[PDB]
Design a protein around this nucleic acid. Structure first.
Lengths: 450, 465
DNA sequence: AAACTATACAACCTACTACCTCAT
RNA sequence: UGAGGUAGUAGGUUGUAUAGU
C-alpha cells in the first residue's frame, strides 16, 4: 500500500509552491511529506527518499526548478524511481510540475516528460483539481478532508522561531519625573503694583496673572530688579498654597479649583523649562504651537556625548537632534519629551522652507532606527543635566525644581527571539511601501530641492 | 515598578471552520467564509485604461512573489486563493474621448470641469446599469494624468468635497452602485516614471501588496465575506460613533455624527446622522442632545433586532471625544433595563513613546499600559511576530483609550479593541493602529457628508470603500 | 424724577482640544 | 504611517454700552 506524496524542489528557491501545495494537499485529506515540513537539518536525504519511493509514495511529484534538476541525490532517487517503475509496472508514477517558466522542453533531463505533464503554467487551481482527479482515477486510499490538523501542522511547523515567547524584557519611555516640586505656590496680590502694559513673559521667573493676584513660584522679593515699586509691598498679603494639596487634589476653595491649580502648575513648569534651557545656550527653531530647539554644531566635543552620536553630517545639510517638552500632571509628576531632528545648511541659520525640513526629517528617519533614537534622546537629556541625577530647573532665587535625568524605565512580561539585521532592510522595504502607497502634490518642492 | 500586560493576537475565522491569525496567510491557506460564483468587472474612461487593466489581469492570473515571504506572504493565484471565475473576457468597456475634455480644459473654472466630467462618469455608469441586462458587480475607474494635473483646485494656468473619490462614492451611494477608483500611475508603474528615470511608484519587489490589496478589495466589493471573528459573544455589538467634524467652508457645520453597526460581520448597517442643527461648529463639548441621541440609539436597536432577531445584551460606544452625564441619561431612557452601555473613546494627541533598550526590534503589538479602571494605553502598532517586523514607522505611537463613563473591565474592552483593529477590510494589511471603527469612521463621515442630495443611506456597506 | 455702584454681557489674553499636507 | 503646519473653540480673563432700587 502506498499513500505518500513528495515534492522534489530546489531549496531554498522553491519553498513557496512546495509549502502551498503541501498544505493544500494535507488540507484536502491526502498525506503529504517533503523537505520543508519534515526533513529538517541533520537528517540524511537520499535513503529516506529511496525507501519512501520503494514502499510509501503513491504519486511522485517533482518541481521543474532551475537548480533542483542538477543535484546528485535527486538523480539517485529518480533512478530508483525508474527502478520501481520497472518493478511493478507503473509508468504513471512520477508527475512533472511546471513552475519555472524559463526552463523549456530541452532543459529538463531524460526521464521526466516521457509521460504526460500536468498543466501548471497559468494558475494553480486547475492544477490541484487535476491532481485530485488523477488521484481519483488511480483509486488511492484517502481520508475525508479536514483542515483542523492542517491548521495544527501549519501552527507547529511554520511558527517555531516565528511566534511569541515568554521571557523578560526591559523598556523605557520618554517620560521624566519631577523629583521635587515647589513647597508653596504663592499668589502675589500686587493690586496697583503691576503696570497695565506689563507683559508677564518678560519676567525672569515664571508667573501667571490670575484676577488681581499673581500665580508664581518666586518669593515676594524676587522681582526687585525690574519692579522698583515692589519695596512697598508687604509680605503678609500674598496667600500661599502648598503644592502637595494640588498634587493630592484635596484642595478645593472658591478661589481656585483643583484642576485649575494643576493647570497652573503645568503652565509654570513649561515656562520654567523654557527659560532654564534657554539659559543653557541652546539654539531655537520656530514651531507653530510649541518651541523646537537644536544643539549648535561644534559645541559638543567630537559631536559625541558619552560616545553617542548627537549631531552629524549627511550630504550637504547638518542634522541636529533636539527635544520639545510639555508638562503633564495627570499620571504622575512627570514631564513628557518629544523627539525631533532639526536641519541646518551650515550649523548657524535654519532652512527657509519647511518642506525641506520635513523631507530631511524623514530621510534621516529611515537612515537610523529606534535604538539610535534612544541613545540620541538619552544623550540630549544627560547633556541637559549638570549633576549626575537631575536637571537644575530655575523658578526663584532660593527655591528650585528637580527633574530626574534617567527616564521612567518600564518592563514587560513576555518578549521575542531577536533575528538578524535583514528585517531592518525589510523595514526599509516597507518604507518604500509607504512611498508607493500615497502621494499628494509632491512635484513642486521635489523639483525645488536642486 | 509597575508592569505592562500582554494580550494575545485574535484568531480570525476562515473557511471550513478554521481560525488563523493572519488575513493574507489565512486567505492563502483555507479561503473565504463564503464562495462566490464569479464576478464581471468593467472599466470606464479611455481604452488605455482598458488595456493596462487587461495586462494587469493577465499578470495577476499568474502567481507573483516578493523579495521574501517573511513579512509579505505569497499570492498563489486568484482562482487558487478564492475559487472565483476571473478571466480576460466578459469585461465591459466604454469609450470616453478627449475632444470635449480638451474643450472644457480651457474653461476658467476647475470646479465646473470637475462637475461636468464627474457627471459624464456618473450618467455613463447609470446608463450602463440601465439598458444592459448584464449585471456588473464592481465598476473600475481609471483616470488620466492630464486631467489629474491641469484641473486641480490649487493649480494655476461649498458643501461638496473637492476630492474626486469622496463625491464619486457619495453620488454612487445615492444610486446604490459600487465602484472603485484607481489612478493610472497606481498599477501602470512599469512605464510610469519621472523625468530622471527612477520610478516614483516603486513596486518592483513589492507587487504582493498590490496583488493582495486589489484582490481583497475586489472580493469584498463582490459581496463575499473573507474572514470573521473566532471567539465572539452574541448579544454584544460595536457602535463606532463617528464624530468627523464637517468642514464645508462657511456653511453651518454643527454635527454630523454617524455610527456603525459592526455587530457580528464585517458589514455595517450604517445610518447617516442628521445635519443636526443644534448649535454651531463651536460645539466642542461634543455630547449629544437627547432627541437625536435616542433617535440614533433606537435606529441602532432596530438594526440589531432586524439583523440578529434579538435585542443586544450590551452595546459598546466607540467615539473620539469625551462624554458627559446628560447624553448618557438620554441613551439610558431608551436602553432596556437588561442592557448595559459603556462608552470608549480613541485619541491621538496624548503622546507616549515606549523604547527598546537592547535589541534591534521595537516595542510590540498587544502590549498595554493600564493607569486606572477607566483610562489606559494600548500598543496595537509596532513589532509583531506574525510578520517578524514592525508595521509602524520609527517608534510606534499608541492609542489612548478612555472609558468615559460606564462599568467595564479594561482587559475585556482591550481584547475587543484589538480584534476590532484586526478587522481591516479595504486592503489586505495585517491590521491597523486604531480600531477600524475609527478609520472607517473617517471614511463614512467624509464620504457621507460629501453630498447634500442624499436622504437615506443604503443599508449595505460595500458602497463605501 | 433722580442718587450709589452694581448691572450684564462678551472681547482679548490663554491650556486642553481639534483640521488639510509632505514625502517616505 | 505620522510628523509637522493651521485655525476652531478651548475655560476663565477684564473692558464694551445698558437700567436696577
Amino acid at each position: 500500500m502506498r499513500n505518500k506524496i513528495f515534492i522534489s524542489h530546489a531549496t531554498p528557491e522553491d519553498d513557496d509552491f512546495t509549502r502551498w501545495l503541501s498544505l493544500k494537499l494535507i488540507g484536502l485529506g491526502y498525506e503529504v511529506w517533503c523537505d520543508i515540513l519534515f526533513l529538517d537539518k541533520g537528517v540524511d536525504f537520499w535513503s529516506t527518499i529511496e525507501k519512501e519511493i520503494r514502499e510509501n509514495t503513491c504519486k511522485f511529484l517533482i518541481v521543474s526548478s532551475t537548480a533542483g534538476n542538477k543535484r546528485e541525490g535527486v538523480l539517485k532517487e529518480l533512478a530508483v524511481a525508474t527502478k520501481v517503475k520497472k518493478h511493478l509496472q507503473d509508468d504513471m508514477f512520477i508527475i512533472p510540475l511546471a513552475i519555472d517558466e524559463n526552463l523549456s522542453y530541452d532543459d529538463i533531463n531524460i526521464e521526466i516528460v516521457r509521460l504526460n505533464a500536468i498543466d501548471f503554467k497559468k494558475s494553480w487551481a486547475k492544477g490541484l483539481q487535476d491532481l485530485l482527479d488523477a488521484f481519483e482515477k488511480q483509486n488511492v486510499p484517502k481520508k475525508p478532508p479536514d483542515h483542523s490538523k492542517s491548521n495544527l501542522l501549519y501552527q507547529q511547523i511554520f511558527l517555531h522561531d516565528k511566534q511569541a515567547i515568554e521571557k523578560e524584557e526591559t523598556y523605557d519611555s520618554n517620560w521624566f519625573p519631577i523629583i521635587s516640586f515647589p513647597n508653596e505656590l504663592r499668589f502675589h496680590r500686587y493690586d496697583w503694583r503691576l503696570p497695565k502694559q506689563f507683559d508677564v513673559r518678560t519676567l525672569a521667573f515664571p508667573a501667571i496673572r490670575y484676577k488681581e493676584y499673581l500665580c508664581t513660584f518666586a518669593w515676594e522679593y524676587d522681582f526687585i530688579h525690574q519692579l522698583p515699586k515692589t519695596e512697598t509691598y508687604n509680605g503678609q498679603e500674598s496667600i500661599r498654597i502648598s503644592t502637595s494639596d494640588i498634587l493630592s487634589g484635596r484642595y478645593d476653595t472658591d478661589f481656585i479649583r483643583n484642576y485649575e491649580c494643576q493647570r497652573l502648575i503645568v503652565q509654570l513648569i513649561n515656562k520654567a523649562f523654557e527659560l532654564r534651557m534657554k539659559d543653557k545656550n541652546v539654539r531655537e527653531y520656530q514651531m507653530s504651537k510649541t518651541f523646537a530647539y537644536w544643539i549648535e554644531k561644534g559645541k559638543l566635543e567630537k559631536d559625541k556625548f558619552e560616545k553617542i552620536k548627537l549631531v552629524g553630517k549627511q550630504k550637504n545639510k547638518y542634522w541636529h537632534f533636539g527635544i520639545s517638552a510639555a508638562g503633564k500632571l495627570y499620571p504622575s509628576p512627570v514631564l513628557m519629551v518629544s523627539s525631533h531632528i532639526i536641519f541646518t545648511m551650515d550649523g548657524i541659520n535654519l532652512i527657509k522652507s519647511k518642506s525641506i525640513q520635513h523631507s530631511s526629517r524623514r530621510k534621516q528617519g529611515k537612515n537610523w532606527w529606534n535604538d539610535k533614537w534612544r541613545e540620541k534622546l538619552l544623550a540630549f537629556i544627560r547633556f541637559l543635566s549638570d549633576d549626575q541625577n537631575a536637571i537644575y530647573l530655575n523658578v526663584g532665587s532660593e527655591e528650585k525644581i528637580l527633574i530626574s535625568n534617567k527616564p521612567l524605565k518600564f518592563f514587560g512580561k513576555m518578549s521575542y527571539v531577536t533575528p538578524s539585521e535583514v528585517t531592518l532592510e525589510e523595514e526599509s522595504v516597507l518604507a518604500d511601501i509607504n512611498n508607493f502607497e500615497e502621494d499628494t502634490e509632491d512635484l513642486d518642492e521635489l523639483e525645488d530641492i536642486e | 515598578m509597575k508592569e505592562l500586560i500582554y494580550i494575545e493576537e485574535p484568531s480570525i475565522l476562515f473557511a471550513h471552520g478554521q481560525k488563523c491569525t493572519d488575513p493574507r496567510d489565512g486567505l492563502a491557506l483555507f479561503g473565504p467564509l463564503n464562495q462566490i460564483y464569479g464576478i464581471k468587472s468593467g472599466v470606464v474612461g479611455t481604452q488605455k485604461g482598458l488595456q493596462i487593466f487587461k495586462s494587469y489581469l493577465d499578470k495577476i492570473q499568474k502567481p507573483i512573489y516578493n523579495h521574501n515571504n517573511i513579512t509579505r506572504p505569497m499570492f498563489p493565484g486568484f482562482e487558487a486563493v478564492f475559487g472565483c471565475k476571473w478571466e480576460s473576457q466578459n469585461i465591459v468597456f466604454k469609450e470616453i474621448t478627449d475632444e470635449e475634455i480638451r474643450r472644457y480644459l480651457f474653461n476658467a473654472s476647475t470646479h465646473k470641469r470637475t462637475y461636468d466630467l464627474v457627471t459624464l462618469f456618473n450618467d455613463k455608469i447609470i446608463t450602463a446599469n440601465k439598458n444592459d441586462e448584464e449585471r456588473v458587480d464592481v465598476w473600475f475607474v481609471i483616470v488620466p494624468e492630464e486631467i489629474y494635473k491641469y484641473c486641480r483646485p490649487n493649480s494655476v494656468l461649498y458643501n461638496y468635497d473637492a476630492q474626486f473619490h469622496d463625491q464619486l462614492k457619495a453620488r454612487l451611494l445615492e444610486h446604490t452602485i459600487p465602484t472603485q477608483i484607481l489612478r493610472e500611475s497606481t498599477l501602470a508603474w512599469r512605464d510610469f516614471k519621472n523625468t530622471f528615470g527612477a520610478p516614483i511608484r516603486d513596486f518592483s519587489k513589492i507587487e504582493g501588496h498590490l496583488a493582495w490589496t486589489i484582490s481583497t478589495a475586489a472580493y469584498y466589493k463582490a459581496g463575499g465575506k473573507p474572514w470573521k471573528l473566532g471567539d465572539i459573544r452574541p448579544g454584544v455589538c460595536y457602535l463606532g460613533l463617528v464624530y468627523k467634524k464637517i468642514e464645508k467652508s462657511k456653511n453651518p457645520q454643527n454635527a454630523c455624527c454617524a455610527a456603525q453597526m459592526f455587530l457580528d460581520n464585517g458589514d455595517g448597517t450604517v445610518f447617516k446622522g442628521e445635519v443636526g442643527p443644534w448649535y454651531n461648529p463651536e460645539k466642542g463639548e461634543y455630547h449629544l442632545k437627547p432627541k437625536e441621541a435616542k433617535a440614533l440609539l433606537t435606529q441602532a436597536l432596530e438594526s440589531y433586532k432586524e439583523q440578529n432577531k434579538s435585542y443586544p445584551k450590551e452595546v459598546f460606544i466607540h467615539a473620539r471625544t469625551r462624554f458627559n452625564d446628560e447624553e448618557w441619561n438620554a441613551f439610558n431612557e431608551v436602553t432596556p433595563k437588561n442592557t448595559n452601555l459603556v462608552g470608549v473613546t480613541i485619541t491621538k494627541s496624548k503622546p507616549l513613546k515606549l523604547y527598546k533598550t537592547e535589541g534591534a526590534f521595537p516595542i510590540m503589538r498587544g502590549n498595554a499600559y493600564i493607569v486606572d479602571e477607566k483610562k489606559a494605553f494600548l500598543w496595537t502598532l509596532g513589532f509583531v511576530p506574525k510578520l517578524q517586523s514592525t508595521l509602524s514607522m520609527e517608534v510606534p505611537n499608541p492609542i489612548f483609550i478612555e472609558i468615559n463613563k460606564g462599568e467595564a473591565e479594561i482587559q475585556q474592552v482591550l481584547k475587543d479593541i484589538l480584534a476590532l483593529t484586526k478587522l481591516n477590510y479595504n486592503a489586505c494589511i495585517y491590521a491597523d493602529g486604531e480600531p477600524v471603527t475609527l478609520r472607517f469612521a473617517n471614511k463614512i463621515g467624509e464620504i457621507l457628508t460629501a453630498s447634500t442630495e442624499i436622504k437615506t443611506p443604503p443599508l449595505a456597506f460595500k458602497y463605501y470603500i
